[PDB]
Amino acid sequence: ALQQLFENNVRWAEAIKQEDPDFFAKLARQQTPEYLWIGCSDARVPANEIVGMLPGDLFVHRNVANVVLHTDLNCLSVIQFAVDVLKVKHILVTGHYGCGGVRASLHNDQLGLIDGWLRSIRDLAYEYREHLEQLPTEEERVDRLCELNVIQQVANVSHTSIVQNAWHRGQSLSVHGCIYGIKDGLWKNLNVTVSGLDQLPPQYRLSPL
Numbered sequence: 001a002l003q004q005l006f007e008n009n010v011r012w013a014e015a016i017k018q019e020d021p022d023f024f025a026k027l028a029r030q031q032t033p034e035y036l037w038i039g040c041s042d043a044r045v046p047a048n049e050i051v052g053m054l055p056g057d058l059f060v061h062r063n064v065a066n067v068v069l070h071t072d073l074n075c076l077s078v079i080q081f082a083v084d085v086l087k088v089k090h091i092l093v094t095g096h097y098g099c100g101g102v103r104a105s106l107h108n109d110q111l112g113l114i115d116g117w118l119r120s121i122r123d124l125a126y127e128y129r130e131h132l133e134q135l136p137t138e139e140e141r142v143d144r145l146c147e148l149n150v151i152q153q154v155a156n157v158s159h160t161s162i163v164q165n166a167w168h169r170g171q172s173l174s175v176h177g178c179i180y181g182i183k184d185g186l187w188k189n190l191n192v193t194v195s196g197l198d199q200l201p202p203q204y205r206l207s208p209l
């Protein structure tokens with residue numbers, strides 16, 4: 001039954017228009033978000049609500065386990081539209097604890113198409129096999145990998161020529177890593193923010209055009 005969603009929508013739009021009749025009209029003229037959110041599709045991690053933003057504030061990409069790949073035009077086109085056209089000032093890479101995509105990459109079941117999508121998280125589980133091994137429970141291993149994943153994705157975003165070229169032309173842009181607790185509603189900073197070319201390892205730095 002989808003009628004509740006349509007009924008909800010009418011109520012919501014109507015309510016907003018009563019408080020500010022021009023709300024949507026004004027918003028529709030130009031798109032000017034300061035932030036891009038890159039997060040998981042997980043239904044429990046809705047971008048705007050978690051950081052108290054309004055329609056218009058947050059350009060959003062969500063995919064399984066918030067994975068960023070330099071050959072994926074889907075995520076990359078969102079990044080590029082955000083950085084080049086909208087000139088967002090911040091990219092918020094937000095993973096979450098208890099991520100099922102991350103959990104899947106730690107185990108050995110085939111889930112189908114998603115198996116290949118999660119490869120890079122599986123790579124992370126392998127390079128940190130010794131670290132993860134020294135954690136007693138599965139829940140801890142999942143959650144630590146969730147964090148490691150976010151930090152890796154922050155690196156991946158910051159290494160894109162999209163981001164580096166923004167910096168090259170003097171555009172101000174920071175890439176942040178955060179993690180959301182589905183258990184407590186808390187959006188936490190992993191404090192791995194990258195804001196300039198000088199923070200990249202030499203092997204990843206790209207010269208200007």
Ligand SMILES: [Zn+2]
Pocket residue numbers: 040041042064065066096098099100101102
């Ligand atoms: Zn997830």
